[PDB]
Amino acid sequence: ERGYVVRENGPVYFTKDMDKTVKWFEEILGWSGDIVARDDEGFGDYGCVFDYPSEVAVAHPFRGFHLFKGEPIKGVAGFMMIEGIDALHKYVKENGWDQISDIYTQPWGARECSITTTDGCILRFFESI
Amino acid sequence: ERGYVVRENGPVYFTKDMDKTVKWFEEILGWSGDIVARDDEGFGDYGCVFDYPSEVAVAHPFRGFHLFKGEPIKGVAGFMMIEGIDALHKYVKENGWDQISDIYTQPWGARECSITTTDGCILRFFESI
Questions:
Q1: Phi, psi dihedrals of residue B11, rounded to the nearest 5°
Q2: Which of A40, A45, A39, A41 is nearest to A21 (CA)?
């Protein structure tokens, strides 16, 4: 570009119950969430979830999801590269969530598996072979 | 989590004609792009765009958009923090794109403006005060 730079560009996520979403992220994937703004009636308007600990987030980068109020995405909402996919699948499974696909190898050189959230969107995870 | 870390998490973006989308990101926002795989008819199935030069990406630290073939997103597709919001607006306008809202101040402490892409999605840009 010219005259400007991108500092952060984290993915967006939409929900009709921000607290439920945050809890799913924390209980099923082991992430940390935080509602940043609430409605006059106490409903979440804006927030976020990240895979690292709350601490690190309070002192800066951002690789989590921004949470906005609205109709949840229908289809793929995330495409994440990770380390420890096997561990991921076990963790999610141990936590009781069964809506996760088996792990499989992609033609482009990586093992993948995808998860459906409480809101119904698909999150795709992958690790290079 | 436990046993796994998120290495990268760039936002997803869907398009029916990747080349046109990539040209837009290049001509209007001054970004860079590359189509990694095409279909039997010549269209891109997978690719990406990023704010920095090609030199970085091939030399990993991925914060652009992953591009997949599909129906464009209706509504907000990006929420990114930037520096030089005035420069951005002028750059876009200077490059002939008129579907960019004016810059305005948000209650939460930042100036913002949204841009409509060639595909119809909305990209929100903000800079804190």
A1: -60, 155
A2: A45
Does residue B53 belong to the interface with chain A, where contact is any CB pair within 8 Å? no
**Structural method:** X-ray
The sign one gets for the Cα dihedral A70, A30, B5, B68 is negative
Q: Select from A12, A36, A95 the residue whose CB has the most chain B CBs within 10 Å, as the one to mutate to test that interface.
A: A12
The pair of three-digit structure tokens given for residue A94, joined into one six-digit string: 């141990």
Chain A residues touching B121 at Cβ < 8 A = none
Return the structure tokens found at A9: 């560009």
Domain boundaries of chain B, sorted by first residue: 1-72, 73-129
DSSP strand pairing (B104-106 vs B110-116): antiparallel
> Phi and psi of A57, rounded to 5°?
-70, -35
Torsion region of A120: left, alpha or beta (phi above 0 gives left; psi -120 to 50 gives alpha): left
CA distance A27 to B52: 36
A85: left (phi over 0), alpha (psi -120 to 50) or beta: alpha
Length of chain B: 129
Does domain B1-72 sit in CATH 3.30.1900.10? yes
Residues of A in contact with B12 (CB under 8 A): 11, 76-79
Token output for B48: 């990406």
